[PDB]
Amino acid sequence: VNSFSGYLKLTDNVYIKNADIVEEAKKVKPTVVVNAANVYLKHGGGVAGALNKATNNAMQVESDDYIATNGPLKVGGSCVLSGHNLAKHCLHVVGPNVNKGEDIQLLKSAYENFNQHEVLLAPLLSAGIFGADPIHSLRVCVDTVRTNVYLAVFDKNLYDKLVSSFL
């Protein structure tokens, strides 16, 4: 039993809710919140911009030190950093950004990072400003993640379409 509330159950391990991931993280304080990161951990917009704003830019400060030490992530890769005031940990996961020409096949690799964590709060990878079809992202999530994932979908209209079209 965990503290996630109001989710529709899609499969044995995948749950979904129309929610602002920032407000959901602040309420649940999950062990792991997933960020929709880029390889530079530049949290300017989309989910990343919103999460970073909620940490008062502390996420960005930590991220800049990480990059200065380690260099950029790989598309499809991830790193674990602090969750600041939102979660114990933040798993920064880089899905392919279609608006940069990146291979959508890397979306499966991106979701594989979730399997290293028993329970996660997460957005749909490569959705929103990353330009992929959120319906496809949900399909890849369901077919790749085996651990317990609680998906937050900001847009109510998109949430309803994802549910109604789910196979």
Ligand SMILES: Cc1[nH]c2ncnc(N[C@@H]3CCCC3(C)C)c2c1C
């Ligand atoms: C402030 C905020 N909180 C969120 N929580 C979850 N998902 C979000 N965006 C999704 C990602 C992919 C599709 C979408 C509807 C843009 C958000 C945003 C913008």
